[PDB]
């Protein structure tokens, strides 16, 4: 029975480490997502201005 | 090698020559070239680790660009100036962020306005040790996000607002927000498991207002959410009510310590518990 | 005797603590994943709008310059 | 009177709360009247009004037993309307009350003179309205007990 | 024995099986999430390229058309 | 400032100016400015908390774009008006959404049409509580998603529509959908573990038509998927079938109460169990 | 609503219009014809028809190809392949191969690799040709590796190794498994899973002979120590010890004991059966 508890302890420790790694990497993921979200708005605004200017010139 | 001497020298030379160029203009290409050189000098100064000069150059470029019909470029330059000024003096960052928020809201979009409001609230809380203006900014951001059906960010902002209101002894708003958020999260396949926690927080607020009010709120919550009847928070609050109903402080302390042993209490929970204990 | 009793009494609380920590981590994970999914949905909408406008603008300008 | 909305409040003093009479502002009603407080469409409880200084007009102060019996919370809206008694039928000739210890600290095996206390009850709340199922506190000699109304006989 | 040993054995076995399932779940989570991360990293560079290209193109074309 | 009266007055004056300007022009070049000013008025109304006025302005802008040779802008205005009217006028929002869906499906894009169909079904379910139209819209969205090689969204839509059909006593549709999704998860490495759940649901549906069919379906699932045997759901189903055979309602009630004690059950599970309970109680 | 009949009628009308317009052939006519073909294909897809839509997409792709336009033809061809995904696998494969050929001309490696992966999926899900699937997966893996996409260049290698092991080519499977395990052990995130790969490699070595399995297990243990304290390695050691004396009872008892705690998939049971039937004799 003691060996059983040892096995559960080891397994739960491993699971906790895996969860910790997932949390940190996902924090990085979210930072990247925020960066791309910031960029796309400027993309769209500049494109809209250029399209309106080109249409007006013609 | 990244010595700042050459970077600073080049930046000041560029600034001086651009000032000379713009000054001569008493047709509009001069303003455009001046703004370009201003942006380049600001970037060079930022590379030189001097943030005040970079922010000043950014602000001057923003003003010059706004002098023309183009306005979104001014907003971009102003937000960059605020980011640069976040180090030395937050007041100028707040002013330029407010101006950028005004321009962006005038344009029509609001999500970026909400993000800038969140940034301003964070700056207020971190630097100016002020909570009321932070509360107002969080409320405005939450309203803006809810206007676009952005439930998660609005819920987080409302959570922060309710927490800060509770810190300031404004229990009614805190309980209202906590109840609303708990009810909203009860009907989700992922957030459901957290619906208990919020309720507990609200319940604690009731204890500050009165005892029988807290008991009735607990009964209402348990009836509304039967699964709340097995969580540790309900048992702790039942034990605290039992101890507090007969002027028993010893049992109160033993229950508090027993619960805290399993899980460490945060500043908010421990402060509220100390207040409740001091009540009687 | 009491050695095994204390061993059994000491090998149960740690599991509870680890499990509770895992629970909290998983809950935070779920909330942030929901937020990221909403952000990505907005991302996709913006990208679709941008590409559609690109097609429209390029077609319009090409036909205009072709006809002069 | 007409069923206007008011608010429940805490008791102003311990003596008034122990009187078992709901405290009301002197500007609203006079002592001796009865009001059937209406909380829900199917929840109406009779109470008597006693006037005490202080207490903002427009609110009624209740003690812990009354709030527990009627389940009122501070700040909750409540409707109060005057109640009129029918002497031909509502007159109380006898009542049945269950008595229990209010605090477990003061338990003792001393004999209790049941009859001696009866007169005191009459001496306490004579001419005061009582309804079936009303829970109240009772003050014996250096003793606090809880009383619950179970039956009423004309 | 009786409820004692049967409970011990059954609960231990069930807990072990569940924990193994959680371990496999977490491994698969990590693999797929790493794939998502590299996918987003791939997005980023092309996003930057597109923004730079569009900015330069619009500036140059506007200047050229205005001067003519 | 944050004053609502000033913003409302400014928006109303701007809208009146735009209306008189468009009326004067009616007496191509000025229509673009009319559209821009209408959009600005709609934005001001939205920020003035007058959702109805913003939706009306968006609809007028959409019409002014429709009369011109432009569709995408008209559809964008349609969706803006629908979202604005979601809070106030559900029917106008539904009309705007369906017109925009028609526009997209005419252009060719499909996924956005599926998302808007799901939104229409959601509003129908949460406000007008009309099960049939929500079911139809979910079916259309699932078909669109499957046609685009999107399986996860199609699977979720199929699950929702099957659950709604089961709630509406149409057991065969739910059974077939659950079996299909169970097989789909069966042929995957990740969802494999959850594959049991769907099968269990199917079993319950069979118990609603006949108990012999329930046994046959349970045996078919067992032979097809051996891992379903060790799961507690199979043991519960077998014990419930045995109790139904012996007509001992007490054993069924005790087993169900114990299963509820170990873990809670959703509304669907309890209502189906109650239906089975009354069906068996009729036998005894 | 309108039923497939009206949609088919409209699509046929559009097709006839495009055919007549191309008949009297110039840029405007061909552009209108290709646009009408695209509209007809979209309507056919709406009408649930999956054969006419593919033909219309292919015609549009050819019309674009004849004109000086390349990526439009590739898009039309990939759309035709997607439409043919449920109509005829051969036509979809041909269209996807043409799209890959067009794409790889300009250096767009990722799209070609994805198309090759889809082609291998087609070849392995319905058709029973595993050599072509292995070749396509190897091509996709090489394409992904050429772009430093090691994370996305490992799944294909694992699939190829598994199929090669199923095809008795144990040397290639062992090499791929060992390479993947060596690459993974360095990564802390993927370290936990690396054990499995090594275990599989051990099995592949056991399929040949017992001494090879013993030496390979020793080499893995020395190279990577944690593999020695895992249940799979315990099973490997037990099986190696038991088989030496021709005792099938111990072999089957250990196999059942391992299966009890955790179930084994088809591949593992097949390999165990092969090993028992081959070496236990």
UniProtKB/Swiss-Prot annotation, chains C, E:
**Which residues does the UniProt record annotate as the domain t-SNARE coiled-coil homology?**
2-64
Tissues in which the UniProt entry reports expression = Expressed predominantly in cerebral cortex, hippocampus, cerebellum, adrenal medulla and retina with weak expression detected in non-neuronal tissues.
Query: Residue numbers for the site described as (Microbial infection) Cleavage?
Result: 63-64
> Can you list the GO cellular component terms from the UniProt entry?
acrosomal vesicle; actomyosin; axon; endomembrane system; glutamatergic synapse; membrane; neuron projection; nuclear membrane
Work out whether the entry's keyword set contains Glycosyltransferase: no
Q: How is it modified after translation?
A: Phosphorylated by CK2.
Instruction: Give the record's keywords alphabetically.
Output: Cell membrane, Coiled coil, Cytoplasmic vesicle, Exocytosis, Isopeptide bond, Membrane, Neurotransmitter transport, Phosphoprotein, Synapse, Synaptosome, Transmembrane, Transmembrane helix, Transport, Ubl conjugation
Any one Gene Ontology molecular-function term assigned to this protein's record: myosin binding
Q: Where is this cross-link: Glycyl lysine isopeptide (Lys-Gly) (interchain with G-Cter in SUMO)?
A: 62-63, 66
Gene Ontology biological process terms from the UniProt entry: calcium-ion regulated exocytosis; exocytosis; hormone secretion; insulin secretion; intracellular protein transport; modulation of excitatory postsynaptic potential; neurotransmitter transport; positive regulation of calcium ion-dependent exocytosis
Query: Where, per UniProt, does this protein localize?
Result: Cytoplasmic vesicle, Secretory vesicle, Synaptic vesicle membrane; Cell membrane; Synapse, Synaptosome
Lipoprotein listed as a keyword = no
Protein family: Belongs to the syntaxin family.
In Swiss-Prot or TrEMBL terms, this protein is called Syntaxin-1A
Originating species: Rattus norvegicus (Rat)
Which residues of the entire protein appear here: the answer is: 191 to 258 of 288
Curated annotation (Swiss-Prot), chain D:
Where does the protein principally reside? Answer: cytoplasm
Specify the domain of life of the species encoding this protein: Eukaryota
**Does the record carry Nucleus as a key word?**
no
Q: Does the keyword NADP apply?
A: no
Q: What one GO molecular function would you report for this record?
A: ATP hydrolysis activity
Q: Which GO terms describe its cellular component?
A: cytosol; Golgi stack; midbody; plasma membrane
Q: How does it assemble?
A: Homohexamer. Interacts with GABARAP and GABARAPL2. Interacts with GRIA2. Interacts with PLK2, leading to disrupt the interaction with GRIA2. Interacts with MUSK; may regulate MUSK endocytosis and activity. Interacts with CDK16.
Function according to Swiss-Prot or TrEMBL: Required for vesicle-mediated transport. Catalyzes the fusion of transport vesicles within the Golgi cisternae. Is also required for transport from the endoplasmic reticulum to the Golgi stack. Seems to function as a fusion protein required for the delivery of cargo proteins to all compartments of the Golgi stack independent of vesicle origin. Interaction with AMPAR subunit GRIA2 leads to influence GRIA2 membrane cycling.
| Name of the featured protein | Vesicle-fusing ATPase
- Gene transcribed to yield this protein: NSF
Section of the entire sequence shown: 1 to 154 of 744
Swiss-Prot record, chain F:
| Residue numbers bearing the Phosphoserine modification | 27, 188
Keywords for this entry? Acetylation, Cell membrane, ER-Golgi transport, Membrane, Phosphoprotein, Protein transport, Transport
What residues bear N-acetylmethionine in this entry? 2
Which Gene3D superfamilies does the record cross-reference, listed alphabetically?
Tetratricopeptide repeat domain
Protein transport as a keyword of this entry, yes or no, is: yes
For this record, the Gene Ontology CC terms, alphabetical, are:
glutamatergic synapse; neuromuscular junction; postsynapse; presynapse; presynaptic active zone membrane; synaptobrevin 2-SNAP-25-syntaxin-1a complex; terminal bouton
Subcellular location, record wording: Cell membrane
Its GO biological process annotations read: apical protein localization; brain development; intracellular protein transport; membrane fusion; neuron differentiation; positive regulation of ATP-dependent activity; protein-containing complex disassembly; regulation of synaptic vesicle priming
* Topology term for the membrane: Peripheral membrane protein
**CDD domains in the record, alphabetically?**
SNAP
Q: Which Pfam families match?
A: SNAP
Question: What GO molecular-function term can you cite, just one?
Answer: syntaxin binding
What this chain does, per the entry, is described as: Required for vesicular transport between the endoplasmic reticulum and the Golgi apparatus. Together with GNA12 promotes CDH5 localization to plasma membrane.
Assembly description: Interacts with PRKCABP, and disrupts the interaction between GRIA2 and PRKCABP, leading to the internalization of GRIA2. Found in a complex with VAMP8. Component of a SNARE-like complex that contains at least ZW10, USE1L, RINT1, STX18 and NAPA/SNAP-alpha. Interacts with VTI1A. Interacts with STX12. Interacts with GNA12 (via N-terminus); the interaction promotes CDH5 localization to plasma membrane.
Identify its protein family: Belongs to the SNAP family.
What is the name of this protein? Alpha-soluble NSF attachment protein
From Swiss-Prot, chain G:
Molecular function as annotated in GO = protein-containing complex binding; SNARE binding; soluble NSF attachment protein activity; syntaxin binding
Q: Record's SUPFAM superfamilies?
A: TPR-like (SSF48452)
Q: Where in the cell is it found?
A: Cell membrane
Question: Which pairs of Cys residues are joined through disulfide bonds in the record?
Answer: none
Query: Topology with regard to the membrane?
Result: Peripheral membrane protein
N-acetylmethionine occurs at which residues? 2
> May I ask which residue range the UniProt record assigns to the signal sequence?
none
GO CC annotation: glutamatergic synapse; neuromuscular junction; postsynapse; presynapse; presynaptic active zone membrane; synaptobrevin 2-SNAP-25-syntaxin-1a complex; terminal bouton
Residues with the Phosphoserine modification:
187
User: Which InterPro entries does the UniProt entry name for this protein?
Assistant: NSF_attach, TPR-like_helical_dom_sf
Q: Which GO terms describe its biological process?
A: apical protein localization; brain development; intracellular protein transport; membrane fusion; neuron differentiation; positive regulation of ATP-dependent activity; protein-containing complex disassembly; regulation of synaptic vesicle priming
Give a single Pfam family match.
SNAP
What transmembrane ranges does the database entry give? none
Q: Which UniProt keywords apply?
A: Acetylation, Cell membrane, ER-Golgi transport, Membrane, Phosphoprotein, Protein transport, Transport
Protein function: Required for vesicular transport between the endoplasmic reticulum and the Golgi apparatus. Together with GNA12 promotes CDH5 localization to plasma membrane.
The record's comment on protein family reads: Belongs to the SNAP family.
Entry protein name: Alpha-soluble NSF attachment protein
**Native organism:** Rattus norvegicus (Rat)
Lineage in the entry? Answer: Eukaryota, Metazoa, Chordata, Craniata, Vertebrata
């Amino acid at each position: 029975s003691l060996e059983s508890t040892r096995r559960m302890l080891q397994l739960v420790e491993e699971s906790k480490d895996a969860g910790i790694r997932t949390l940190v990497m996902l924090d990085e993921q979210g930072e990247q997502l925020e960066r791309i979200e910031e960029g796309m708005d400027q993309i769209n605004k500049d494109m809209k201005e250029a399209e309106k200017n080109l249409t007006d010139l013609g | 090698g990244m010595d700042t001497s050459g970077k600073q020298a080049e930046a000041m030379a560029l600034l001086a020559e651009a000032e000379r160029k713009v000054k001569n203009s008493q047709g509009s290409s001069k303003i455009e070239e001046a703004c370009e050189i201003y942006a380049r000098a600001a970037n060079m100064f930022k590379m030189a680790k001097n943030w005040s000069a970079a922010g000043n150059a950014f602000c001057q470029a923003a003003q010059l660009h706004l002098q023309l019909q183009s306005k979104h470029d001014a907003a971009t330059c102003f937000v960059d100036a605020g980011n640069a000024f976040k180090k030395a003096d937050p007041q100028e960052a707040i002013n330029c962020l407010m101006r950028a928020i005004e321009i962006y809201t005038d344009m029509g979009r609001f999500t970026i306005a909400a993000k800038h409001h969140i940034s301003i609230a964070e700056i207020y809380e971190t630097e100016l040790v002020d909570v009321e203006k932070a509360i107002a900014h969080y409320e405005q951001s939450a309203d803006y996000y809810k206007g676009e059906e952005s439930n998660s960010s609005a819920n987080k902002c409302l959570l922060k607002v309710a927490g800060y209101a509770a810190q300031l002894e404004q229990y009614q708003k805190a309980i209202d927000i906590y109840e609303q958020v708990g009810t909203s999260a009860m009907d989700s396949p992922l957030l459901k498991y957290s619906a208990k926690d919020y309720f507990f927080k609200a319940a604690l607020c009731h204890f500050c207002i009165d005892m029988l009010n807290a008991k009735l709120a607990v009964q209402k919550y348990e009836e509304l959410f039967p699964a709340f009847s097995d969580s540790r928070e309900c048992k702790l609050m039942k034990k605290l009510l039992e101890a507090h109903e007969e002027q028993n402080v010893d049992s109160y302390t033993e229950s508090v310590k027993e619960y805290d042993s399993i899980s460490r209490l945060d500043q908010w929970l421990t402060t509220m518990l100390l207040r409740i204990k001091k009540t009687i | 005797a009491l050695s095994e009793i204390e061993t059994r009494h000491s090998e149960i609380i740690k599991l509870e603590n680890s499990i509770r920590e895992l629970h909290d981590m998983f809950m935070d994970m779920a909330m942030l994943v929901e937020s990221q999914g909403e952000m990505i949905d907005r991302i996709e909408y913006n990208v679709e709008h941008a590409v559609d406008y690109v097609e429209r603008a390029v077609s319009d300008t090409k036909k205009a310059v072709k006809y002069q | 009177m007409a069923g206007r909305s008011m608010q429940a409040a805490r008791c102003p003093t311990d003596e008034l709360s122990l009187s078992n009479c709901a405290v009301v502002s002197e500007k609203d009603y006079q002592s001796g009247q009865h009001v059937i407080v209406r909380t829900s469409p199917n929840h109406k409880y009779i109470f008597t009004l006693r006037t005490h200084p202080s207490v903002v007009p427009g609110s009624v102060a209740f003690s812990l037993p009354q709030r527990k019996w009627a389940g009122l919370s501070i700040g909750q809206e409540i409707e109060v309307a005057l109640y009129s008694f029918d002497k031909a039928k509502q007159c109380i000739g006898t009542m049945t009350i269950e008595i229990d210890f209010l605090q477990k600290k003061n338990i003792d095996s001393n004999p209790y003179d049941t009859d001696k206390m009866a007169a005191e009850f009459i001496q306490q709340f004579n001419n005061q309205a009582f309804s079936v199922g009303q829970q109240l506190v009772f003050s014996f000699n250096d003793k606090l007990f809880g009383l619950l109304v179970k039956d009423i006989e004309a």
